[PDB]
C-alpha cells in the first residue's frame, strides 16, 4: 500500500489559531483564516521556492468575526467562501477583496462551509443552531434547510454529485442526506464515541470522518457500511483538521503533531511534531504534499517521503 516513513518540512511560515487552510481550484494559491479575523491568500510556489524572510500574503481580507472554515469555489478560481462565529457564510472575490454574498440566516456560529465540485454555485453550511443550510450563489436566500436535533460540526458535498451531503454531528453520527428528499437521511453512520468534527470524501463512495474520540473512520456510502477505524493520534477536545485524498488521511492532534494514515492500514504511517494543537491540514490533491497549520499560527508545507 505505501513506501513512506516520514514527513519532510519543505517550507515554514513562522507564527493565533488557524482554523482552516485550503488550496484553490488549481492548487496554485492557498488561504488561511481563523481567530485573527483575516483571510490571507498565499502563492504556493512562492512559499516553496523563496526564503522564509520574504514570505508575504498576496491578498489579505479583514473580517467582522472569527473564521471557522474556508472553501474555495471549484469553477470560479478567485472565489472563496468562509463561515464565521456569528453564523455568517460569506463568498469573497480575492481579486477585488470584496464580499460577493453575505448569507446571514444561521442563528449561532457556523462551523463549516463547503462549495460543491460538480454544481459549483452550490455551497452548504452547518451550525450550532442545528440547521444545515444549502445556498446557491445566484440567490440571496437559502434554498434548502434541514432541521436537525444536535449541533452540526461539519458538512461536505459528495465529490461526484451535488445531491448528497455528509453531516457530522455532535450526536456522534454521520447523517448522509440526499438533498432531493430531506424527510430522512439516506443513512446514519454510527460508531464514533464522541462528536464527529469533520467529514471528507476520498472518492464518490468512500467517506472519512474525524471525531473527538481520537479516531478517524472510513465508511462506504454506496452500500452503507463501516470499513475501518484509524487510531494513534490524540483528539478529545478541539477541531484539529482532517484532509483526505484518493489513498491517504491526515489529521491534527492535541499533542501538536500531524498524523498520516494510509486508508488500508489502521495505525499511522508517520507523523510530524511541530514545535499547542494542530488546527488545520490540507493535502495538495493526490500528491504527497500537504499544508498544515497549528494553534500558534505556524504554517508548514510537508511532503511524505520514503
Amino acid at each position: 500500500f505505501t513506501r513512506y516513513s516520514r514527513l519532510r518540512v519543505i517550507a515554514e511560515i513562522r507564527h493565533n489559531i488557524v482554523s482552516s487552510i485550503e488550496f484553490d481550484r488549481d492548487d496554485e494559491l492557498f488561504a488561511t483564516a481563523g481567530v485573527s479575523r483575516c483571510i490571507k491568500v498565499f502563492d504556493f510556489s512562492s512559499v516553496v521556492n523563496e526564503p522564509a524572510d520574504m514570505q508575504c500574503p498576496i491578498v489579505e481580507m479583514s473580517t467582522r468575526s472569527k473564521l471557522s472554515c474556508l472553501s474555495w469555489n471549484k469553477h470560479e478560481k478567485n472565489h472563496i467562501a468562509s463561515s464565521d462565529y456569528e453564523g455568517i457564510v460569506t463568498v469573497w472575490d480575492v481579486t477585488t477583496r470584496q464580499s460577493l454574498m453575505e448569507y446571514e440566516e444561521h442563528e449561532k456560529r457556523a462551523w463549516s462551509v463547503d462549495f460543491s465540485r460538480t454544481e459549483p454555485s452550490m455551497l452548504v453550511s452547518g451550525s450550532d443552531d442545528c440547521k444545515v443550510k444549502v445556498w446557491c450563489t445566484r440567490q440571496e436566500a437559502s434554498v434548502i434547510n434541514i432541521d436537525m436535533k444536535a449541533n452540526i460540526c461539519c458538512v461536505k458535498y459528495n465529490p461526484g454529485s451535488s445531491n448528497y451531503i455528509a453531516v457530522g454531528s455532535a450526536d456522534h453520527h454521520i447523517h448522509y442526506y440526499d438533498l432531493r428528499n430531506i424527510s430522512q437521511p439516506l443513512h446514519v453512520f454510527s460508531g464514533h464515541k464522541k462528536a464527529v468534527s469533520y467529514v471528507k470524501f476520498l472518492s464518490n463512495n468512500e467517506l472519512a470522518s474525524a471525531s473527538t474520540d481520537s479516531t478517524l473512520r472510513l465508511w462506504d456510502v454506496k452500500d452503507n457500511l463501516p470499513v475501518r477505524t484509524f487510531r494513534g493520534h490524540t483528539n478529545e477536545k478541539n477541531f484539529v483538521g482532517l484532509t483526505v485524498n484518493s489513498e491517504y488521511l491526515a489529521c491534527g492532534s492535541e499533542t501538536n503533531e500531524v498524523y498520516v494514515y494510509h486508508k488500508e492500514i489502521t495505525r499511522p504511517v508517520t507523523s510530524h511534531r511541530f514545535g499547542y494543537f494542530i488546527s488545520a491540514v490540507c493535502w495538495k490533491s493526490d500528491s504527497p504534499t500537504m499544508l498544515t497549520a497549528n494553534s500558534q499560527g505556524t504554517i508548514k508545507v510537508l511532503v511524505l517521503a520514503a
Binding site: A170, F239, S295
Partner: peptide, 9 residues
C-alpha cells in the same frame, strides 16, 4: 482556550 472546542450533544 475554548474557541475550537467541538460541541458534545
Amino acid at each position: 482556550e475554548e474557541i475550537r472546542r467541538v460541541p458534545e450533544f
